[PDB]
Structures are given as structure tokens and as C-alpha cells.
């Protein structure tokens, strides 16, 4: 008995090398079964999928596999695979990352978070709602991991202040602790879906949409925001109600208010750099939203059609961060000859942007884009579409429900970005076969791959929440089951009621054929 356990532990210890070596051997027969080009493309796609799910290699490193394999297998030349990694979607992501780095550099995010928590209240239900709305709004522009990692200390400080008898009161104490510590990552994950720059899978959707359907241009920052933000708010409210119900039982408050006040005043008086960064971020968001909302002609209409994008706007905005002064200019500096000649500092130096930008996610997005390109050009997409004949009789709404459920179940064990990268061509081909708008199935999958609530390995915010040490896997799975159910239902509602008027999903687009 002990020998079997020892052998299992030993083989689990070297899981990465074993899976790396044995995945290609297991995946040889798909090459023989399928036509050469299609078989090789499916082989490399499945190899990347398994490597991503198992984490045999770093996700960014696995994203570089097409460079090795597409030329070797003859799927695509190297000079065509390589440029896929910096499609304009990746310059949009990069502008969002630079803006987020500027926001975190001057502690603007902490100031906004503390202000919202001050405004919302201190009552446990009010505090749950305020912390969730704070994390959701703050993850719309920042990363989910950073938002969770910053909101955890604030929650711990607030609870320590609040709780600074028998079993009822202290059991309520643990219940409130669990509720606060679990409401942060779920809210971060929900709020990441509101904006394209909020999370990577939305940008995966953009890149693979430009790949599979070059003429599709109805998804941008404004349309995605107006579609997802109401859905984000509805899902956040549902999650708040559920979490307060299960945990919150739906002088101390003075102490919590005092501690949050003293935490806010620890930031000192607001700095000129803070106003500059906030105004730049507001201009960034407005310009991205108003570039082309598809129902008021944006400022991109008066320029040359088909030339501008969100990437150019984001890069243009974040360029100003690298030369705008961080100290208030004064005209009297010129006149005062005895004034010091100290060199001024920009709002964001490039060193900070270099060391506070996740280039690994950029490489992952690029790998997804290039894999989509290779799958399209190798003819694997049409092969999958032909093989999907038995599913042509499923009603489109039922198909959306099933694909959302499948992807939301799959994302509980793999990263959201890898999940959507793997599943998006399948959804594209299924939508083509069903004679329905491709976005009507792509967007459900893109949103639902972020519905990772049940496990710590589902999404790094959940990993941080578990690392807080006050949460159990049972609590997270119990909450996340209903979180996934409500998310799927609300997503179906959104895709069947108001996504139709936004993305014009009612009619099959002509560019889909």
C-alpha cells in the first residue's frame, strides 16, 4: 500500500517533464488520421493546449511554440507567424498596461479605493457591497491579481479593527471574515470583463476575430463596454446578494470608520502627479469610448476610414505619460535666477513601465493570435466545420447555453486566456455551421471563460484569496457553483436581449461567408 503511494508521489514530482515528453507521443496519431496540413496544425494546437493546461512550460514559453512548429511542419512560414505576435490588439493591451502602471505608481488606485469605501459605508452588508464595487471598478483598468493583492490588506485591516457569546457571535465573525475575503477575487474577476483592457481573454477575442474574420469591425472599446458593463453590474449585484446571504446573515463601526480614515490620511495631501495621471486616464477612457461607438460618429470618422484603431489612441495617450512633468510648473521659475536647476521628473519613467508590465501575457496573446492564424490558413477550421455536422440542429440559444457551461467548467482548471485561445476557433466554426452570427457564440465563450470561481487554481486572485489562509476549498466551491450558474444565466440573458441591438447579432453578417 505504501509502495503505491510512494510511486504516485514520485511520478507526481516529475509531472512536468513526463507530460512534456509523452504528450507528443500520445498526439502522433492525429497527424496520421487527418490530412497532412490539417493534422499537423491540430497536433500543434493540442500540444499547446495540453502544455497550457498542465503548465509543463511557462504560458509565455508555450505561446512561442508556433514559431518552432509552424515552419517545421510547413503550416506557415516564419516571416508570417512572427508578425502575428504584435497585432494592434497587443499595442492596445500594452497601452492599458502602461496606464495601469502609471495609476499604481502614484497610488491613485489606493486613493480611489479608500474614497469609495469611505463613501459606501461601514455596515457589513454595505461594506461587502462597497468593497466588491471598488474591486470591480478598479479591475476594469488594473489587473485582477494586483487589485486582489491590494484589496486584501485593506479588508484584513478593517476586520482587525472591527473585531479588535458562546458560538453564535464568533461564528458570525468567521463568516464575515470569509465573506470579505472571498468577495474581493470574485468581484475582481467579474469587473475584469467589463472593458477590453480589463482582462486578456477579451483581447484574445479581438485578435482571433481580426484573424478569422478580417472584415469584422463591430467590436471595439465602446461597444464592448456598453455591452458588458450592465452585465458586469448585474452579475456583481447578484454575487453581492449571494455572498451576503450565505455569510453575512442577510462602537465597532466607529472603530472601522476611524481606521479607514487614518489609512486614507496616510496617503498625505493629493499630489500634482495624481491629478495629472487621473486627468490623463479620464481622457484615455473617454477617447477610447468615443472613438467609434457605432451609433454616434466618433472622432475617427473625420479622419481616414480604416486607418485609426484603439491601439493608436492608447499609444498616443500613454506617450504623454513619459514626458509630462510630475511637479507643478511655475512661470516664476524662469524669472528667479537663484532658483535651483534640478532636472524634472516625468509622470512615468520607462524603467517603471518595464518592470511593471506583464510581457508574458503579451506573448501569450500573441501566441493565441498566431495559432488562430495558423488554424485558419492550414485549413483546420474548415475541417472542424465539416466535422461539426451533427451539431447543426441545436437551437442557437441552447447552443450558447451549452458552450457557456462547457467553457465555464473548463476554466475552473486552466487559465482563462489559454481556455479562450483553445476554444475560440471551435466556437467560430460552430457559429458558421449553425448559420448564426459568429459573435453570438464568441462573446459568450469570451465572457464565460472568466467565470472561474470554484478553485484557487482557477484564477490568480483566487490563489491570493486562498493564500490569505482564512478560506477553505469547500467554501469557495459552494459559492462558485451558484456564481457560475448565475453568471451563465445572466450571460444568456445579455446575449439574447441587448447584445442583439449592440452587435447586430440578429442577422447573419455577409462577411461571415
Ligand X SMILES: CC(C)CCC[C@@H](C)[C@H]1CC[C@H]2[C@@H]3CC=C4C[C@@H](O)CC[C@]4(C)[C@H]3CC[C@]12C
Ligand Y SMILES: CCCCCCCCCCCCCCCCCC(=O)OC[C@H](COP(=O)(O)OCCN)OC(=O)CCCCCCCCCCCCCCCCC
Shortest distance (Å) from residue 447 CB to a copy of itself? 25
Residue list 474-513, contact with ligand C14 (CB under 6 A)? none
- In which region does residue 74 sit, left (phi positive, over 0), alpha (psi from -120 to 50) or beta (all else)? left
Given 18, 19, 20, 402, the residue binding ligand C14 (CB under 6 A): 20
Residue list 184-243, contact with ligand XKH (CB under 6 A)? 192, 199-201
Radius of gyration of the chain (CA): 25
Which partner from the list ligand Y, a copy of itself, ligand X, none does 315 bind, CB cut-off 5 to 8 Å by kind?
A: a copy of itself
Given 50, 59, 73, 441, the residue binding ligand C14 (CB under 6 A): 73
Q: Is 84 in the site for ligand XKH (CB under 6 A)?
A: no
User: What is the three-class DSSP state of 346?
Assistant: strand
CA nearest to 298, candidates 210, 216, 223:
223
Per-residue HEC secondary structure of 269-284 comes to CCCHHHHHHHHHHHHH
Q: Is 301 in the site for ligand X (CB under 6 A)?
A: yes
Identify the DSSP state of 9. H
Which partner from the list a copy of itself, ligand Y, ligand XKH, none does 192 bind, CB cut-off 5 to 8 Å by kind?
A: ligand XKH
Given 13, 275, 319, 327, the residue binding ligand Y (CB under 6 A): 275
**Exposure b/e, 194-203, CB count within 10 A at least 16 = b:** bbbbbbbbbb
User: 34 - beta bridge partners?
Assistant: none
Given 13, 327, 387, 501, the residue binding ligand Y (CB under 6 A): 387
| Binding letters toward ligand C14, positions 36-55, x by CB under 6 A | -------x------------
| Binding letters toward ligand C14, positions 52-71, x by CB under 6 A | ----------------x---
Residue list 5-64, contact with a copy of itself (CB under 8 A)? 6-7, 9-10, 12-14, 16-17, 20, 56-58, 60-61, 64
Shortest distance (Å) from residue 436 CB to ligand C14? 27
Identify the DSSP state of 469. S
And the C-alpha cell for 52?
497550457
Which partner from the list Na ion, ligand Y, a copy of itself, none does 46 bind, CB cut-off 5 to 8 Å by kind?
A: ligand Y
Torsion of CA 284, 288, 289, 291, to 10 degrees: 130
User: What is the three-class DSSP state of 415?
Assistant: coil
Q: Distance between CA atoms of 450 and 461, rounded to whole angstroms?
A: 12
Q: Which is nearer to Na ion, 139 or 484 (CB)?
A: 139
CB-based contact 139:191 (threshold 8 Å):
yes
Q: Is 50 in the site for ligand X (CB under 6 A)?
A: yes
Q: Which is nearer to ligand C14, 24 or 121 (CB)?
A: 24
Q: Which is nearer to ligand Y, 241 or 455 (CB)?
A: 455
CB-based contact 315:91 (threshold 8 Å):
yes
Given 17, 22, 33, 72, the residue binding ligand C14 (CB under 6 A): 72
Given 35, 46, 121, 226, the residue binding ligand X (CB under 6 A): 46
Distance of CA 146 to the CA centre of its chain: 12
DSSP H helical ranges for 139-251: 144-162, 168-192, 200-212, 221-246
Give me the residues that bind ligand Y (CB under 6 A), please. Answer: 30, 33, 45-46, 49-50, 53-54, 111-112, 115, 270, 274-275, 278-279, 282-283, 285-286, 384, 387, 422, 425-426
Amino acid at each position: 500500500m505504501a509502495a503505491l503511494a510512494a510511486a504516485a508521489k514520485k511520478v507526481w514530482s516529475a509531472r512536468r517533464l513526463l507530460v512534456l515528453l509523452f504528450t507528443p507521443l500520445a498526439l502522433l496519431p492525429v497527424v496520421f488520421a487527418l490530412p497532412p496540413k490539417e493534422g499537423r496544425c491540430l497536433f500543434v494546437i493540442l500540444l499547446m493546449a495540453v502544455y497550457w493546461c498542465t503548465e509543463a512550460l511557462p504560458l509565455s514559453v508555450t505561446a512561442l511554440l508556433p514559431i518552432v512548429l509552424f515552419p517545421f511542419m510547413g503550416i506557415l512560414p516564419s516571416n508570417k507567424v512572427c508578425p502575428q505576435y504584435f497585432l494592434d490588439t497587443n499595442f492596445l493591451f500594452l497601452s492599458g498596461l502602461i496606464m495601469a502602471s502609471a495609476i499604481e505608481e502614484w497610488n491613485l488606485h489606493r486613493r480611489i479605493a479608500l474614497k469609495i469605501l469611505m463613501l459606501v459605508g461601514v455596515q457589513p452588508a454595505r461594506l461587502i457591497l462597497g468593497m466588491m464595487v471598488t474591486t470591480s471598478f478598479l479591475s476594469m483598468w488594473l489587473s485582477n491579481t494586483a487589485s486582489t493583492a491590494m484589496m486584501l490588506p485593506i479588508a484584513n485591516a478593517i476586520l482587525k479593527s472591527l473585531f479588535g457569546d458562546s458560538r453564535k457571535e464568533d461564528e458570525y465573525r468567521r463568516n464575515i471574515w470569509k465573506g470579505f475575503l472571498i468577495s474581493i477575487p470574485y468581484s475582481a474577476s467579474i469587473g475584469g470583463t467589463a472593458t477590453l483592457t480589463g482582462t486578456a481573454p477579451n483581447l484574445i477575442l479581438l485578435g482571433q476575430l481580426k484573424s478569422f474574420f478580417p472584415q469584422c469591425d463591430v467590436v471595439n472599446f465602446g461597444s464592448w463596454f456598453i455591452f458588458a458593463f450592465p452585465l458586469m453590474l448585474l452579475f456583481l449585484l447578484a454575487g453581492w446578494l449571494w455572498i451576503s446571504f450565505l455569510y453575512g446573515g442577510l462602537n465597532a463601526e466607529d472603530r472601522a470608520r476611524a481606521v479607514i480614515r487614518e489609512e486614507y490620511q496616510n496617503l498625505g495631501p493629493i499630489k500634482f502627479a495624481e491629478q495629472a495621471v487621473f486627468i490623463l486616464f479620464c481622457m484615455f477612457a473617454i477617447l477610447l469610448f468615443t472613438r467609434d461607438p457605432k451609433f454616434i460618429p466618433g472622432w475617427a470618422s473625420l479622419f481616414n476610414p480604416g486607418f485609426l484603431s484603439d491601439a493608436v489612441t492608447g499609444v498616443a495617450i500613454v506617450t504623454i505619460l513619459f514626458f509630462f512633468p510630475s511637479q507643478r510648473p511655475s512661470l516664476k521659475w524662469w524669472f528667479d535666477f537663484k532658483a535651483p536647476n534640478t532636472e524634472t521628473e516625468p509622470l512615468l519613467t520607462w524603467k517603471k513601465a518595464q518592470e511593471t508590465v506583464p510581457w508574458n501575457i503579451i506573448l501569450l496573446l500573441g501566441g493565441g493570435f498566431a495559432m488562430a492564424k495558423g488554424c485558419e490558413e492550414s485549413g483546420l477550421s474548415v475541417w472542424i466545420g465539416g466535422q461539426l455536422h451533427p451539431l447543426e440542429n441545436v437551437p442557437p440559444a441552447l447552443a450558447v447555453l451549452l458552450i457557456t457551461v462547457v467553457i465555464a467548467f473548463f476554466t475552473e482548471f486552466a487559465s482563462n486566456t489559454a481556455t479562450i485561445i483553445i476554444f475560440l476557433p471551435v466556437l467560430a466554426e460552430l457559429a458558421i455551421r449553425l448559420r448564426v452570427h459568429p459573435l453570438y457564440l464568441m462573446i459568450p465563450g469570451t465572457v464565460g471563460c472568466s467565470f472561474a470561481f470554484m478553485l484557487p487554481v482557477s484564477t490568480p486572485p483566487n490563489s491570493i484569496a486562498f493564500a490569505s489562509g482564512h478560506l477553505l476549498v469547500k467554501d469557495m466551491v459552494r459559492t462558485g457553483l451558484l456564481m457560475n450558474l448565475m453568471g451563465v444565466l445572466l450571460l444568456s440573458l445579455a446575449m439574447n436581449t441587448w447584445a442583439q441591438t449592440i452587435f447586430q447579432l440578429g442577422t447573419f453578417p455577409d462577411w461571415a461567408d
